[PDB]
Write a protein that binds this ligand. Structure first.
Ligand SMILES: [Mg+2]
Ligand SMILES: [Mg+2]
Ligand SMILES: [Mg+2]
Ligand SMILES: [Mg+2]
Ligand SMILES: [Mg+2]
Ligand SMILES: [Mg+2]
Ligand SMILES: [Mg+2]
Ligand SMILES: [Mg+2]
Ligand SMILES: [Mg+2]
Ligand SMILES: [Mg+2]
Ligand SMILES: [Mg+2]
Ligand SMILES: [Mg+2]
Ligand SMILES: [Mg+2]
Ligand SMILES: [Mg+2]
Ligand SMILES: [Mg+2]
Ligand SMILES: [Mg+2]
Ligand SMILES: [Mg+2]
Ligand SMILES: [Mg+2]
Ligand SMILES: [Mg+2]
Ligand SMILES: [Mg+2]
Ligand SMILES: [Mg+2]
Ligand SMILES: [Mg+2]
Ligand SMILES: [Mg+2]
Ligand SMILES: [Mg+2]
Ligand SMILES: [Mg+2]
Ligand SMILES: [Mg+2]
Ligand SMILES: [Mg+2]
Ligand SMILES: [Mg+2]
Ligand SMILES: [Mg+2]
Ligand SMILES: [Mg+2]
Ligand SMILES: [Mg+2]
Ligand SMILES: [Mg+2]
Ligand SMILES: [Mg+2]
Ligand SMILES: [Mg+2]
Ligand SMILES: [Mg+2]
Ligand SMILES: [Mg+2]
Ligand SMILES: [Mg+2]
Ligand SMILES: [Mg+2]
Ligand SMILES: [Mg+2]
Ligand SMILES: [Mg+2]
Ligand SMILES: [Mg+2]
Ligand SMILES: [Mg+2]
Ligand SMILES: [Mg+2]
Ligand SMILES: [Mg+2]
Ligand SMILES: [Mg+2]
Ligand SMILES: [Mg+2]
Ligand SMILES: [Mg+2]
Ligand SMILES: [Mg+2]
Ligand SMILES: [Mg+2]
Ligand SMILES: [Mg+2]
Ligand SMILES: [Mg+2]
Ligand SMILES: [Mg+2]
Ligand SMILES: [Mg+2]
Ligand SMILES: [Mg+2]
Ligand SMILES: [Mg+2]
Ligand SMILES: [Mg+2]
Ligand SMILES: [Mg+2]
Ligand SMILES: [Mg+2]
Ligand SMILES: [Mg+2]
Ligand SMILES: [Mg+2]
Ligand SMILES: [Mg+2]
Ligand SMILES: [Mg+2]
Ligand SMILES: [Mg+2]
Ligand SMILES: [Mg+2]
Ligand SMILES: [Mg+2]
Ligand SMILES: [Mg+2]
Ligand SMILES: [Mg+2]
Ligand SMILES: [Mg+2]
Ligand SMILES: [Mg+2]
Ligand SMILES: [Mg+2]
Lengths: 351, 141
RNA sequence: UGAAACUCAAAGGAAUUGACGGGGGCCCGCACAAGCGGUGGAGCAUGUGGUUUAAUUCGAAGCAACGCGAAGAACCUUAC
RNA sequence: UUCGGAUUGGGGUCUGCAACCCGACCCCAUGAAGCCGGAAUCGCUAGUAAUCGCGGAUCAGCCAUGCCGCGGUGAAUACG
RNA sequence: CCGAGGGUAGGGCCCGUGACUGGGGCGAAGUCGUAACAAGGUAGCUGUACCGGAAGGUGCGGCUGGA
RNA sequence: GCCCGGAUAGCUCAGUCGGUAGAGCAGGGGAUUGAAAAUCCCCGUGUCCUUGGUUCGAUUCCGAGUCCGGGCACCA
RNA sequence: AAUUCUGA
RNA sequence: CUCCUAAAAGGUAACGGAGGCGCCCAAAGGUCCCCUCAGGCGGGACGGAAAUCCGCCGGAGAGCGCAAGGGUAGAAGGGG
RNA sequence: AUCAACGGAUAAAAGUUACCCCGGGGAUAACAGGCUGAUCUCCCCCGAGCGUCCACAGCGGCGGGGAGGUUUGGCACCUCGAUGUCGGCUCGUCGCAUCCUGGGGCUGAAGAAGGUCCCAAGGGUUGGGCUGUUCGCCCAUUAAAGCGGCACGCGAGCUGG
């Protein structure tokens, strides 16, 4: 975490790529099309900031006993001159490390976890309820406004569904790696002979985004024809352009209407339908987008877990990274800040 | 936008426009102002669409004084409906404006930005306007 | 009259020993019934779930865990 | 209510280095809820139940109304 | 004359394919109820008939692998 | 567009001459259960859609508005 | 005339 | 029936703007005699921000059974 | 007496007609014209802001001014002693607000291609599938497969879906 942060950042890698930036940089090769220039210095600052990183490390490493003299001498100034450059250091130590992780699209949004009990029927419905209390307490004590969306207390035990809001900053970026399958091994409190069975669950997580609903269509967005309606009407139907036709060029969807004898009221009913059928293509694409934001995994059956929890052998093995703690009880109650970082490191690794 | 929040009667007669303002011929607020040359009913939509045209031009600057207020209910019969059968329904609101009326006036800005933030608003009005700066009539002795 | 693909490591007969029966016969126990005094209500003591907390140390969980380890927690104890 | 003694203010003794969290008592002043307890539900067949008081272990003190003992008074009912 | 073969017309068999649809096997977790195994909580099963979200129910006669 | 009828607890719905406010369901606390259901006690929350007015007071009686339910839009 | 009890 | 439209007499149309009436009082009627409001500011146990009191200031903004208008306390209003 | 249709026809009364009829009306609707131009089509003013940069290569928020007389309307002026109504076919002709082809300025025009505005109708502007269709969509092309006015041209020229 603190002592380890360095390595997994391109600690030795970056400091070699860094000069590759400035590499092609100099020698203005007919600087025509603007491209690297942008991500030229910004990618550079990253570099020599691994020194500010080894300075806040050294200033924080030369700080291990950087108070051995303050354990022998309390009053002075030659000992309060580097300190105003040491308090700020223990700050960036965290900064240049968690500002390298959360470094992705939209995380600072309020999150929305969802818990659905996988296999194991009733066990899973309960193990689900426990997984609920977990993030809750966590996010709760973590300084996050927690709003309960849903809670469907299933059949015999536990729940069937749960969805809650995570009001705060980077709430999503935090409770994001959690998204996935969570297994639970322990003798079934439900089973008869307190036998040993395995439980599964699903925990989805997504950023809060859409709040409004706007669907207005510019005139040029469409096209309106008018022709003589087909049907009864004697001279009328014959010599009037009562029949309308709205066509939305982009989608190609078109609507026709000869309902009433008024070209006018028919345009009205027309668009009225057109809109309706436009929101349907608007919501059809409004969800094929946000649903591809759930993932591409989680069959919620066996062998899909990404971190199991055991209680009759006290431990918690995170399959994703390999990490394995020995305090299931602590994890299931808040303790997460450990596996959350790591969870990211693993992930953000490929981007 | 910009309409009353009351009035005793929802719809009122069309009235008539016999020239020369009833008042508001002198500029009694800001430095430079805008005065109407030809009679007309200015719409709520127009007043606003010029008030912004104004600010937007000189963003984060002086103060604008709107001295006309649309308190006349403007009506109109639906489309394709025939004559009679009661008075049309309200469309929006207008403000009566006769020749000489100082509609607008800006304050706390350079004449450079005055005789411009006005020239623009003028193009948003259905009538001819002219610009003026405080002069003859002042409230003193 | 009468198949197949596909799929399972069994399907199945009888007879054992038990367990079980809103099967039977026989028979016990404050099990009911007969009777007396309580609990649930109230204020307080204590144990526990829970929540809260920097921590509110751990265990016990139906009967057979909950005045149980505790036949003595101000610091000791004491594990937080 | 001369029932019932919660809560609270004020004054004190004692143990302990020290009792604000957190001690047990003492005295003055407060005097709360509670007019026999819904659905339910426990114990006991005789010196038993019910009822009264005492002792010990623990232990400086003590949150014991707990636990383990001792005796004093002394029932009801059991067809089946 | 016959004649390989080519064309024309209509048949028969088999293989492949088809929007949709029928029921089937399998599937360590759903929803509904609980039909059968103990007088299985209306003894069960059976050929057939009618009915019903579903097991199933009921009628008629048959068997006992039930009383 | 016209003309009827609506909106009341979380869902489905009663209710009054103008002062009041409800039922069945869901839901919370208890009880039997080994544990659920069922069953059994205890429970409560509503501007009675919005916005005006009349009244001393409006869920209630009138104006208007929004959403939903019906019925018509015919001769050419 | 009173159901249900998954999966090591 | 009341206002406006209606162009300072009266009158004046439109499927023009906006509302009321189809009753009511045995006192809400005659007359005689008294009385004067609504509000606002301070003061006052319960007391809203108007219950009933007290004191100043208040020319009619109150009241007049119900729509609107005119009228009106030098009473048409309040009481006997 | 809700004779409330409120100067009150009887004491006493609803529908339907595409099976219809007569008397009347262009005093009055449906077609066409007319007047109007809200709607429609085209044009322009302003310049927020877009266009990596830069208001105007290409665009134009809020607002504003017009033109045309193709559409849906408003009105009800000739015509009800009759002005035959859709589409197709045939025959065309006029407009320009140009779909090709001829000229030309800009360009975010390298070139070939395009885009936008200007000038310019001389002549051109295909064949089919579906539908009564106008309108549209599609197939196969093309230099292009223009938009309108002519009583939505044309039934004493035809068809009659
Ligand atoms: Mg589920
Ligand atoms: Mg759900
Ligand atoms: Mg017809
Ligand atoms: Mg027509
Ligand atoms: Mg305001
Ligand atoms: Mg004059
Ligand atoms: Mg055979
Ligand atoms: Mg056998
Ligand atoms: Mg027996
Ligand atoms: Mg005994
Ligand atoms: Mg009690
Ligand atoms: Mg342990
Ligand atoms: Mg514990
Ligand atoms: Mg103790
Ligand atoms: Mg310690
Ligand atoms: Mg103390
Ligand atoms: Mg009792
Ligand atoms: Mg007692
Ligand atoms: Mg031959
Ligand atoms: Mg076949
Ligand atoms: Mg069967
Ligand atoms: Mg059964
Ligand atoms: Mg049975
Ligand atoms: Mg049964
Ligand atoms: Mg049968
Ligand atoms: Mg039956
Ligand atoms: Mg039978
Ligand atoms: Mg409701
Ligand atoms: Mg009440
Ligand atoms: Mg009820
Ligand atoms: Mg309950
Ligand atoms: Mg319960
Ligand atoms: Mg209630
Ligand atoms: Mg039952
Ligand atoms: Mg079930
Ligand atoms: Mg089982
Ligand atoms: Mg007059
Ligand atoms: Mg006059
Ligand atoms: Mg007063
Ligand atoms: Mg008060
Ligand atoms: Mg009189
Ligand atoms: Mg009198
Ligand atoms: Mg009569
Ligand atoms: Mg009559
Ligand atoms: Mg009459
Ligand atoms: Mg009659
Ligand atoms: Mg017929
Ligand atoms: Mg005939
Ligand atoms: Mg006939
Ligand atoms: Mg006849
Ligand atoms: Mg005739
Ligand atoms: Mg005429
Ligand atoms: Mg005439
Ligand atoms: Mg006409
Ligand atoms: Mg004509
Ligand atoms: Mg515009
Ligand atoms: Mg024309
Ligand atoms: Mg016309
Ligand atoms: Mg006329
Ligand atoms: Mg005619
Ligand atoms: Mg003639
Ligand atoms: Mg003729
Ligand atoms: Mg030209
Ligand atoms: Mg070129
Ligand atoms: Mg053809
Ligand atoms: Mg055809
Ligand atoms: Mg032509
Ligand atoms: Mg024609
Ligand atoms: Mg025909
Ligand atoms: Mg024919």
């Amino acid at each position: 975490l603190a002592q380890r942060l360095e390595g997994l950042r391109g600690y030795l890698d970056i400091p070699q790529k860094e000069t590759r930036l400035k590499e092609l940089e100099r020698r203005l090769e007919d600087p025509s099309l603007w491209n690297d220039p942008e991500a030229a210095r910004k990618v550079s600052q990253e570099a020599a900031r691994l020194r500010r990183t080894v300075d806040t490390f050294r200033s924080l490493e030369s700080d291990l006993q950087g108070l051995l003299e303050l354990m022998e001498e309390l009053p002075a100034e030659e000992r309060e001159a580097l300190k105003p450059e040491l308090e700020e250091a223990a700050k960036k130590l965290d900064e240049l490390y968690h500002q390298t992780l959360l470094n992705f699209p939209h995380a600072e949004k309020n999150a929305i976890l969802t818990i659905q009990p996988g296999a194991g029927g009733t066990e899973a419905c309960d193990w689900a309820e426990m997984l609920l209390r977990m993030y809750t307490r966590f996010a709760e004590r973590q300084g996050f406004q927690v709003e309960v969306v849903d809670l469907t207390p299933g059949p015999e035990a536990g729940i069937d569904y749960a969805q809650i809001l995570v009001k705060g900053e980077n709430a999503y970026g935090l409770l994001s790696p959690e998204a996935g399958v969570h297994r639970l091994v322990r003798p079934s409190p439900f089973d008869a002979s307190g036998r040993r069975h395995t439980s599964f669950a699903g925990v989805e997580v997504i950023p809060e985004v859409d709040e409004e609903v706007e669907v207005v269509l510019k005139p040029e967005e469409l096209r309106i024809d008018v022709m003589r309606a087909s049907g009864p009407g004697g001279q009328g139907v014959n010599t009037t352009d009562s029949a309308v036709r709205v066509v939305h060029l982009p989608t190609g969807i078109t609507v026709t209407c000869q309902t009433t004898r008024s070209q006018i009221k028919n345009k009205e009913l027309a668009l009225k339908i057109l809109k309706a059928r436009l929101y349907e293509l608007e919501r059809k694409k409004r969800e094929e987008e946000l649903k591809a934001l759930r993932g591409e995994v989680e069959p919620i059956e066996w062998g899909s877990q990404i971190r199991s929890y055991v209680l009759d052998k006290n431990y918690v093995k995170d399959h994703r990274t390999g990490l394995m703690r020995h305090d299931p009880e602590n994890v299931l109650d808040g303790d997460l800040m450990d596996l959350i970082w790591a969870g990211l490191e693993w992930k953000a690794g490929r981007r | 936008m910009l309409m009353p929040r009351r009035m005793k009667y929802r719809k009122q007669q069309r009235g008539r426009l016999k020239g020369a303002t009833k008042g508001g011929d002198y500029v009694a607020f800001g430095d430079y102002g805008l005065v109407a040359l030809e009679p007309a009913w200015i719409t709520a939509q127009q007043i606003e669409a010029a008030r912004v045209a104004m600010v937007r031009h000189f963003r984060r600057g002086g103060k604008i004084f709107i001295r006309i207020f649309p308190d006349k209910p403007y009506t109109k019969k639906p489309l394709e409906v025939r004559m009679g059968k009661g008075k049309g329904n309200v469309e929006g609101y207008v403000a009566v404006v006769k020749p000489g009326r100082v509609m607008f006036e800006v304050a706390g800005v350079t004449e450079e930005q005055a005789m411009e933030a006005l020239r623009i608003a003028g193009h948003k009005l259905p009538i001819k306007t002219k610009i003026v700066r405080r002069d003859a009539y002042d409230e003193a002795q």
